[PDB]
Amino acid sequence: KNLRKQKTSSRRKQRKAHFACNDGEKRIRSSARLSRELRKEYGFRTFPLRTGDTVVVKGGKFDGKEGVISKINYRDYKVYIEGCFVTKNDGTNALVPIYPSKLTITKFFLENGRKEQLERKKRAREHGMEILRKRQEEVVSN
Amino acid sequence: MQHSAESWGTGRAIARVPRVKGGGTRRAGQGAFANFCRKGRMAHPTKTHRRWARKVVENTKKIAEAMAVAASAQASLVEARGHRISDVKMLPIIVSDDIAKARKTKDAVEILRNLNMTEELKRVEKSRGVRCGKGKMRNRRYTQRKGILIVHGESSEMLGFRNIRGVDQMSIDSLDLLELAPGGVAGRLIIWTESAFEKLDKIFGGVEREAELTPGFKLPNRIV
Amino acid sequence: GSRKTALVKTRLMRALKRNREIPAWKRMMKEHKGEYNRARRHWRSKKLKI
Amino acid sequence: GKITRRTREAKKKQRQPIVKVCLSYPIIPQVEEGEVIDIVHERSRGAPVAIISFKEDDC
Amino acid sequence: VLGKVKKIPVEEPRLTKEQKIERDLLIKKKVSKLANSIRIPPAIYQFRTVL
Amino acid sequence: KGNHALPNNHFRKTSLKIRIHHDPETKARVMAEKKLRKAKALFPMPLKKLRPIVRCPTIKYNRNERLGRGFTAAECEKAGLDYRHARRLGIAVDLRRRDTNQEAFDKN
Amino acid sequence: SKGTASFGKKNKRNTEMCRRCGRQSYHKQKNSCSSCGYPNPKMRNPGSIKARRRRTIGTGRMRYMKRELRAAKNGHKGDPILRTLW
RNA sequence: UACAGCCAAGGGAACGGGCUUGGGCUGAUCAGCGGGGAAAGAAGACCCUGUUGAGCUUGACUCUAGCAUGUGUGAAGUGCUGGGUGCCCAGUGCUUUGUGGAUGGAUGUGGG
RNA sequence: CUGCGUGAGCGGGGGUGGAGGGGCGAUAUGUGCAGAUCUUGGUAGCAGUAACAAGGAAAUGAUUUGCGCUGGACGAGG
RNA sequence: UCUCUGUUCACGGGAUUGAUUGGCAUUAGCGGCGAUGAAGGACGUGCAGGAGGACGAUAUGCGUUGUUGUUGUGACGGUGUCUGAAUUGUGUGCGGUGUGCACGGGGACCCCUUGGACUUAAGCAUAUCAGUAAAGGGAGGAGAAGAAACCAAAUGGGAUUGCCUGAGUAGCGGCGAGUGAAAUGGCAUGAGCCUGUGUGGUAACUGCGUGGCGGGUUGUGUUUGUGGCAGCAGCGGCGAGUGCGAUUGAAUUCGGAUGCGGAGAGGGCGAUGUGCCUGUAGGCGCGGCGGCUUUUUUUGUGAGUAGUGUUGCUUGGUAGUGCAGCGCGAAUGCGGUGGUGGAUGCACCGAAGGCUAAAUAUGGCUGAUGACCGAUAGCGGAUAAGUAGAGUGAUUGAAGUGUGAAAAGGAGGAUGAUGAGAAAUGAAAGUGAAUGGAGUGAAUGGGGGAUGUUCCCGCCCGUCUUGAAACACGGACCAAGGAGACGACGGCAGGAUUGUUUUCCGAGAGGGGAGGAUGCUGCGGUCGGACCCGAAAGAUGGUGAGCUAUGUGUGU
Ligand SMILES: [Zn+2]
């Protein structure tokens, strides 16, 4: 019951697939982009997020801050970062939720089997960039 | 009409419309079925077998396509309906058939700046926006002006002209009226290739000589 | 009455342990505030029909 | 119209009949000897009924 | 259905593998006696003469 | 009322039904894909059979010819062939038709 | 006294819960359900147009028919152990 | 519950709160009361009209369940008395080896 | 609040509001309300009126005293 | 103070503007249940749980495999209390005591049986509505039909099924109202076979079993696909290209730059988007499931049938168009048919046994679309809706969407805090407070003049009617909804394109030259629910003797 590769271009069907998909698809729609200096080691652009990653905010009142993710809520599209808070009417602090597509990944987390997820996708991309080169260079003759 | 409603008749000091049967709910005793009752049906319901299309005389269809082709060479008509042209050499515009070798979009955009069609593709870009009333939520959200039309004579399509915002394509063997005179007003800006431009005397013929590739058709004669 | 069949007794028991309000630990949550059970029955107004 | 009383009283009696006991005596070609063991009243009859006992049969 | 009594089907009792055999031979006798009490044509009666 | 032709519109039956296909352009091209898919499942053999030339019956259509159903067993025999073997070579055979004209017999 | 006073005599109950359909419509003196027709082997013809859409295929749980529909999309392969015998 | 609320005459769809020409209590309360508002309630049940119904009757028109009476179908073999011209039929007893459950059409009757 | 128009109607200014809105030509219509004992929802007058309740008391009330007549069990129904 | 009337602030109510994970329509595929226990019902399962949803004693979920570190989830496999056809049964085949099959669910579309009335005829009985609705039995992804005992009248065509023409025609019909074909011609799709008389130098045949048993001479006669060819659906993964300045609570706005494009479809993100994310164009990888595809020599037949007298139904079928009951009941160089009863020529065909793709129909499910509706609309149902509730029962059946970008926070009052903003917008009817003016006259209106009035004129609208201010009927007040649109066939007017147009009279026998066609808009005519709302009735299929009436068993 995955829905993010729908053929339809109907507005009601697309908003329905964003707000009501399963939790597996909520994580891929919560994807972030890598920095320039981290995108020279791995070849790819965006990768999804988890706790422990270091990011940087871009736009809003926390524009320019940097911190570590302390909690994620995939179902509601909410990320909590250490250092972006507010004081309630009691003296206490609370963390503010941010939307995942306004962050940039720098120095992610590599401990619970995540070092291999990055290496599997780095191989699939360079294998796919050669099917395109062989086709292109031969279609160069085409 | 999904009730067993019946009128109560006269003698009870209420009007004669039919009314819901039952008890124990606020629906019980209210009006039903009539076009002036809440939750009723329409007086004359809309039906699926009304006529949606119309028939055009076949010869008048071809007279209209020939007027639209004729008006694409008057510079006063092509500038009346937009189409900013101050730097084209002459109308009509004809290029060779070797633009089909531009299969990357980066090259097709270079061919179009060489023909001085540059400030035309900028006018279409800046006209795009959201539609005003209720149609925006019926899958019709953006609108924009019409741009250039490329009439070629090759097969399915030119892949390198397909992404440009403000460019259409049409085959010489189709030649439809809905692309030639958009909105019903003639005078679009058309670019011909040299193979397509030479087939124009067989499709339309003359005023006193019949056309081959279209049996019977002759241009209409003049009344003044 | 005191006399009743076995099938009448087990449906009266099921109806009995249904007539209850939302528990307090669920109402105290952040995203369940302002919620009451609203499917409640009082033995004088509405009858069960055996 | 509706159905007359005569016809309904006939239908009530096939549903809930009046029953009498069917008196009769058996076949015995040789001269035997009986024995009146009782004389009794019966519902729906006016005549009393006798119970007579033979060597291998009652009537 | 208008003050009447019911339809009362029958579905009479069934024979059990020895009443049936007892019922087949009753029919074979009743039918054989009718075949010898009416006049028998010549082409069927000639088979009553064997070696 | 008025001077008009007498009308004869038959809509007095409630059981009557209306029938419309609202998109005959997509229905034609879905049937041309079916037709090209049979053709390359029979690939070498051409999906249509050879049919004869016949003559329209009455005095109104007397002077007109037409494609017919099939050839006869005598037309197949004189062309050097058996009608059981003409059917394996893509030729249609009709054993109901009779032979009564010598010119038409020769065209076929 | 056919109105209010006659309502105080209505304390006998003619029906009980039906063991096929679960409504209070099994008439005990008649031995018959007025909703579904039990104990006839077939179910009764519904009495109205709306009655057909209150109790049909899909208004309950469909505990088996859902499973069978997921199996017919994959060709009815069964338990992977037993597949050797087949 | 159109809006309102004091009378005489006139004319008016021939008994006006309002129209025309005259006569007038009393500045805003409380308790009573049954002249008027042709007071309220209910698309007059009486009466007429409609090419609108239904309960019931019979000597209305057209039909029909049931019932009566000839006649076709059904089971084989025999005797007997009578009709007309050798003939077809009537009753008819007997024998056992079919069966009694029915079924087609015709005339009469039929406010159930 | 103010200008224009014989009229159906169309403009401008100051508050409020917090996201979209129009002109002109052709074309498609479920295209304009005071009434139908019209439909659904809300609200007046009548009117703080009709109707109903205010059960004998003793500063207190597990104490003292005054009045009424159903009282106690099994079944149906809950 | 009270009554009426200006102004400002506060109420009361939920119209309006703008949104929408809902509805509705057309189109392409599919049409997948059950004795191997279904659909439906009852009761249960979470450490802390009511509704809903999910699940079955392996119970708020277990195994394998993919993706994940998470309140985790996708694809497939297993389990499934007590019930229910509910069966430890009833019927029946093969065997000879073993082992099969049928039953229920659903029924839009299809086949067979049975079979109305409303309605139209301005009344009504034949007729019409209509062999239609309702009821019952039997099937499938379609079904049924089908390879001439045909059509016809030429120099002849050549199985079934669908569409256009033929044609509102030939005809049937209180010859009234009405009703109503086909062949030919033009298209789509195309395909033909099996059997009851098969050896006699030996049943050459097959259900069960491992060289045998059962059947069969009253007659059996049944090899073969991990191979090829064509197609259809699904799953997984890779997927190009960005930075400054001003305004803002926040920018996708405005102003300079710099890139991608077989990708400028659509959606989200604090607001209006080609380089912020998801996808998109386009390549790769992996299952699965079907269709075609193997051909030893064979000759001959269809009976309680066809037909026919009588009776009933049906069709355009007119003197059977077709079907059925009862009775009679055929032929073998023979039998059947040719739009009027019978005769005779000539023409054309072989019934009474069996099977057969494709082109056609259609609730629901899944994909893709739209000049459709936008909370009194659209499905009854945008929410714990066939729910809450009503009825003995069959049945019946609603009302209810919105704090904010962020919970950053309130909820008797007062004092305050946060926020861009106290927080969707907030009409009329009606009301409270303050303040200006007027009054003891029913009020309200027009002319002419004026910071209220003084003079003149002025009875309450809509409707039926010869005639209404009426002692004629409807109308307390406000908002929203609310009625000549659509289809078929003909005529005329205006307009568009083209123009080398015409099968005549007459019942017949006979006689014989004389500018339209195809669309578009409007109006008049007829049949359709037919401008909108309204009877007393008639028919088909089902529910009730807990009130009340009579009989009967057993108590007081
Ligand atoms: Zn039941």
Please provide the DSSP assignment of chain B as one string.
Answer: --S--B---SSSSS--S-B---SSSTTTT-B-SSTTSTT---SS---TTS-------HHHHHHHHHHHHHHTT-HHHHHHTS---SS-SSSSEEE-GGGGG--SHHHHHHHHHHTT-HHHHHHHHTT-EE-SSGGGGTT--EE----EEEEE-SSS--GGGSS-TTEEEEETTT--HHHHSGGG----EEEEEHHHHHTHHHHH--SSSPPTTSTT--PPPP--
Q: Using a threshold of 3 CB pairs under 8 A, tell whether chains C and D touch.
A: no
Nucleotides of J under 7 A from a protein CB: 18-22, 25-29, 32-34, 38-44, 48-51, 54-56, 66-80, 83-86, 91, 103-107, 128-130, 132-133, 135-137, 148, 152-159, 168-169, 178-180, 184-186, 188-193, 229-232, 236-241, 243, 249-251, 260-270, 272-274, 276-280, 282-284, 288-291, 348-349, 361-362, 367-372, 374, 376-381, 384, 386-399, 406-411, 416-418, 481-483, 485-491, 496-498, 518-521, 524-536, 541-548, 551-552
Min Cα separation E9/chain D (Å): 17
Locate the DSSP E strands across D1-59: 36-40, 49-52
- Summarize chain G as % helix, strand, coil (round to 5): 25, 5, 70
Of all residues in chain B, the one with the smallest CA distance to F21 is: B49
Q: Using a threshold of 3 CB pairs under 8 A, tell whether chains B and A touch.
A: yes
Here the tokens at position G48 are 């109205």
**Please, are residues A2 and A27 in contact by the beta-carbon 8 Å criterion?**
no
Q: In what order do the strands lie in the sheet with A31-34?
A: A47-48, A31-34, A103-105, A54-57, A66-73, A78-87, A93-98
Residues A52 and D20: their CA atoms lie apart, in Å, by 104
- Enter the DSSP assignment of A31: E
Min Cα separation F48/chain B (Å): 29
What are the angstrom distances between the C-alpha of A90 and each of A42, A84, A86, B80? 46, 18, 11, 69
Q: Is G13 on the interface with C (CB under 8 A)?
A: yes
Residues F21 and C36: their CA atoms lie apart, in Å, by 54
Q: Would you call F66 helix, strand, or coil by DSSP?
A: strand
CA of C2 to the centre of ligand 1 (A): 28
Residues A38 and D22: their CA atoms lie apart, in Å, by 117
- Chain D residue numbers touching E3 (CB-CB < 8 A): 8, 11-12, 15
Written as one letter, the residue type at A124 is A
Closest CA to B199 of B57, B97, B78, B99: B97
- CA C2 to chain CA centroid, Å, is 22
For nucleotide H57, the protein residue with its alpha carbon nearest to C1' is D1
G7 is in an annotated binding site: no
Helix axes B105-114, B118-125, angle to 10 degrees: 120
Classify residue A53 by burial, with Cβ atoms within 10 Å: 0-12, 13-18, 19+.
buried
Closest CA to E5 of D21, D6, D10: D10
Min Cα separation E10/chain D (Å): 20
**Please, are residues C16 and C31 in contact by the beta-carbon 8 Å criterion?**
no
Protein CA D3 to sugar C1' H111 (Å): 14
Residues A50 and A105: their CA atoms lie apart, in Å, by 11
The technique by which this structure was obtained is cryo-EM
Rg of chain A over Cα atoms, rounded to whole angstroms, equals 19
